[PDB]
Enzyme design. Structure first.
Site, mmCIF file in Angstrom:
data_model
loop_
_atom_site.group_PDB
_atom_site.id
_atom_site.type_symbol
_atom_site.label_atom_id
_atom_site.label_comp_id
_atom_site.label_asym_id
_atom_site.label_seq_id
_atom_site.Cartn_x
_atom_site.Cartn_y
_atom_site.Cartn_z
ATOM 1 N N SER B 159 -1.206 -8.708 -0.434
ATOM 2 C CA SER B 159 -1.806 -9.873 -1.088
ATOM 3 C C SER B 159 -1.986 -11.044 -0.120
ATOM 4 O O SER B 159 -1.857 -12.209 -0.509
ATOM 5 C CB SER B 159 -0.990 -10.313 -2.310
ATOM 6 O OG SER B 159 -0.999 -9.317 -3.320
ATOM 7 N N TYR B 229 -6.514 -13.557 -6.776
ATOM 8 C CA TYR B 229 -5.974 -13.496 -8.125
ATOM 9 C C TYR B 229 -6.355 -14.663 -9.024
ATOM 10 O O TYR B 229 -6.190 -14.546 -10.244
ATOM 11 C CB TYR B 229 -4.443 -13.376 -8.073
ATOM 12 C CG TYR B 229 -4.003 -12.228 -7.196
ATOM 13 C CD1 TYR B 229 -4.292 -10.915 -7.547
ATOM 14 C CD2 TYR B 229 -3.324 -12.454 -6.006
ATOM 15 C CE1 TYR B 229 -3.907 -9.859 -6.745
ATOM 16 C CE2 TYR B 229 -2.933 -11.402 -5.197
ATOM 17 C CZ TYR B 229 -3.227 -10.108 -5.572
ATOM 18 O OH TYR B 229 -2.841 -9.058 -4.774
ATOM 19 N N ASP B 270 -9.713 -0.110 1.968
ATOM 20 C CA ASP B 270 -10.499 -1.308 2.218
ATOM 21 C C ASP B 270 -11.129 -1.249 3.603
ATOM 22 O O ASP B 270 -10.478 -0.853 4.577
ATOM 23 C CB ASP B 270 -9.630 -2.560 2.085
ATOM 24 C CG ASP B 270 -8.911 -2.623 0.753
ATOM 25 O OD1 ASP B 270 -9.421 -2.035 -0.224
ATOM 26 O OD2 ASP B 270 -7.839 -3.257 0.680
ATOM 27 N N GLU B 282 -7.362 -1.342 5.740
ATOM 28 C CA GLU B 282 -6.050 -0.863 5.324
ATOM 29 C C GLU B 282 -6.198 0.046 4.114
ATOM 30 O O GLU B 282 -7.237 0.069 3.449
ATOM 31 C CB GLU B 282 -5.104 -2.021 4.984
ATOM 32 C CG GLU B 282 -5.440 -2.714 3.670
ATOM 33 C CD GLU B 282 -4.298 -3.560 3.143
ATOM 34 O OE1 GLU B 282 -3.134 -3.298 3.519
ATOM 35 O OE2 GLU B 282 -4.564 -4.487 2.351
ATOM 36 N N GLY B 288 -3.826 -3.035 -7.187
ATOM 37 C CA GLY B 288 -3.686 -3.842 -8.380
ATOM 38 C C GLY B 288 -4.386 -3.222 -9.574
ATOM 39 O O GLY B 288 -5.421 -2.570 -9.456
HETATM 40 N N1 LIG Z 1 -9.742 -8.368 11.670
HETATM 41 C C1 LIG Z 1 -10.144 -9.080 10.589
HETATM 42 N N2 LIG Z 1 -11.389 -9.602 10.509
HETATM 43 C C2 LIG Z 1 -11.794 -10.311 9.439
HETATM 44 N N3 LIG Z 1 -11.014 -10.563 8.371
HETATM 45 C C3 LIG Z 1 -9.739 -10.102 8.317
HETATM 46 C C4 LIG Z 1 -9.226 -9.316 9.450
HETATM 47 N N4 LIG Z 1 -7.959 -8.983 9.148
HETATM 48 C C5 LIG Z 1 -7.680 -9.508 7.929
HETATM 49 N N5 LIG Z 1 -8.738 -10.173 7.432
HETATM 50 C C6 LIG Z 1 -8.765 -10.860 6.121
HETATM 51 O O1 LIG Z 1 -7.436 -10.887 5.594
HETATM 52 C C7 LIG Z 1 -7.382 -10.214 4.332
HETATM 53 C C8 LIG Z 1 -6.106 -9.393 4.200
HETATM 54 O O2 LIG Z 1 -5.918 -8.532 5.323
HETATM 55 P P1 LIG Z 1 -5.045 -7.194 5.124
HETATM 56 O O3 LIG Z 1 -4.830 -6.537 6.469
HETATM 57 O O4 LIG Z 1 -5.647 -6.428 3.970
HETATM 58 O O5 LIG Z 1 -3.668 -7.850 4.602
HETATM 59 P P2 LIG Z 1 -3.049 -7.480 3.160
HETATM 60 O O6 LIG Z 1 -2.578 -6.053 3.311
HETATM 61 O O7 LIG Z 1 -1.933 -8.481 2.977
HETATM 62 O O8 LIG Z 1 -4.206 -7.656 2.203
HETATM 63 C C9 LIG Z 1 -8.618 -9.337 4.266
HETATM 64 O O9 LIG Z 1 -9.117 -9.245 2.929
HETATM 65 C C10 LIG Z 1 -9.609 -10.028 5.173
HETATM 66 O O10 LIG Z 1 -10.440 -10.887 4.390
HETATM 67 K K LIG Z 2 -1.117 -1.526 2.560
HETATM 68 MG MG LIG Z 3 -2.272 -4.613 2.042
#
Ligand SMILES: Nc1ncnc2c1ncn2[C@@H]1O[C@H](COP(=O)(O)OP(=O)(O)O)[C@@H](O)[C@H]1O
Ligand SMILES: [K+]
Ligand SMILES: [Mg+2]
Lengths: 304, 324
Positions: B159, B229, B270, B282, B288
């Protein structure tokens, strides 16, 4: 400080786990109670555990999981279990939820090092040499780019292993491995080959023991040239750090045609006084009682 | 037939988890009892668990772990916990030792998918395109092989908790300290901008089926906690406006990563879409199920209604345990 020793297990290594508990109990410099997991998964506490220890085999236990154990009466838990439900992160997860500091790798490192396929993918990506291998999943036909001899192993079991000499026999080996795990690995068998083993101690940033060799005698130290001895220890510490291992690990290598290949990281190695991991750190100036004390101290340090 | 639903947790996603329980409880087509892990780690059972739900937050619990539950009453456990202690294999390992079938990924896949460093190592080795990244340990001097802008994250998080977008190396130490509040290991990724965020749901054991590809839109700098959220703040394009080859590729890469990691039950995978290039961001093994959540809406768009999705998740859990 009181320590809880959990040994036995439902894995085929139930007996060698009890033999490791006997050696630890004979030398640990702490008050230590033993808890046995019988081969049927039920637990033995108090005197029945020691009785199961002397019998060298606990076929049937008394208490179903979770056991009525006075967890609050122990400062450190030493999971001395080998294989499935021992080194694969399940017991570690239980202890994490119990809030008890415990010896050895955490959930992620335990599960990763137990997976023969995923651990190699991590190691190969980090630049650590491993033997050529392929994963085969049950049903999906195998795609093997190299030639026999292979080893065909269940990927997550730690039994069902075959040395395949003819491609013709691969489907039978996969069938044998698949009855213990839905995913199998096929590894190129090196020959001639030497087996080298080195112990690591510490949290993430560990120290390497002298290198030993399996030839079944334990050559300690292993008869290695200075350059090869160093590379083995360097490769072990790198792998240890990449996988995030805590506490300890015995890192097994292959030596063939002058090339090193990381074979397997054992987060709960055999722990009899004559086992490779305690003997290696003995040769490195860390005696068996001191080795056990440091493993307990490292469990508390990680817990803050 | 009876499902035990577990929600809450001691992770930062505790309140998100209780929201997902409400969504699952509303449409699950099985008799389902709720158990709540309060933020202190202690469990609430029976009527107190339902009261904790309407509170949308459970600060304190009654029963310490392990709770006095009659596990023989329940045929399937549904761990609806997000983040640490729930999505990373710890709760799964407990359910393994209990011998109880449970929804979602196993111990290894959960732990691997919750680690943003090790998961990318596996995916990059299997040829799945990922953003260039580097791992940093607590108290270890950071060596960033590339140049800002960065995204600094704790290796184990969800999140968007603890994530910073960095534009100067002077801001990196503060971004790493924020990340080290939630994990002893951090990742430093190369920030992509402009970036489109594509999400696709997967259902099945190891060999999954993909949902339609969806897209996330917002005005905030990135998909942060408040955006994810707060209703209306993030807009969900379902299905996403993409070329056929692009939706196809996203689904193929989702199933490939799903298979390599051995995920069971479900995952929302994602992706980043930037300058025509795809990047797997990831995998989320416990996505959710809340009103602003993408996973059930995507399968609904693909013909799998909310109760049918929950029915198959429960049946997949039974199939793996009793038959493999
Ligand atoms: N390398 C990246 N380039 C652009 N946006 C990013 C990048 N890494 C993370 N983000 C932004 O951060 C958000 C969460 O990253 P994520 O790795 O999914 O963390 P979490 O697992 O906590 O969601 C993503 O939805 C994206 O919008
Ligand atoms: K994860
Ligand atoms: Mg995550």
């Amino acid at each position: 400080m009181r320590v809880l020793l959990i040994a036995g297990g439902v894995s085929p290594e139930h007996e060698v786990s009890l033999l490791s508990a006997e050696g630890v109990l004979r030398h640990i410099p702490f008050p230590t109670d033993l808890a046995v997991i019988a081969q049927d998964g039920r637990w033995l506490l108090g005197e029945k555990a020691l009785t199961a220890l002397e019998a060298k085999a606990a076929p049937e236990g008394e208490h179903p999981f979770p056991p009525p154990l006075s967890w609050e009466r122990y400062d450190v838990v030493f999971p001395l279990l080998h294989g499935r439900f021992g080194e694969d992160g399940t017991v570690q997860g239980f202890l994490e939820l119990l809030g008890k500091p415990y010896v050895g790798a955490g959930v992620a490192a335990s599960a990763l090092c137990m997976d023969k396929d995923l651990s190699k993918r991590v190691l190969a990506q980090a630049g650590v040499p491993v033997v050529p291998w392929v994963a085969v999943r049950k049903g999906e036909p195998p795609v093997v780019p190299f030639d026999p001899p292979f080893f065909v192993k269940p990927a997550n079991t730690g039994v069902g292993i075959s040395r395949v000499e003819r491609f013709q026999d691969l489907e039978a080996a996969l069938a044998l491995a698949f009855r213990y795990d839905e995913k199998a690995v096929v590894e190129k068998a090196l020959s001639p080959v030497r087996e080298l083993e080195v112990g690591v101690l510490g949290n993430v940033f560990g120290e390497a023991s002298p290198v030993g060799e399996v030839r079944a005698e334990l050559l300690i130290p292993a008869p290695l040239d200075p350059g090869t001895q160093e590379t083995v220890q360097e490769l072990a510490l790198k792998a240890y750090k990449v996988l995030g291992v805590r506490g300890m690990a015995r890192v097994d290598f292959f030596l063939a045609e002058g090339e090193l290949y990381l074979n397997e990281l054992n987060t709960i190695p055999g722990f009899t006084p004559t086992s490779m991991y305690p003997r290696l750190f003995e040769a490195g100036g860390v005696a068996y009682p001191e080795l056990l004390r440091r493993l307990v101290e490292l469990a508390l340090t990680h817990h803050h």
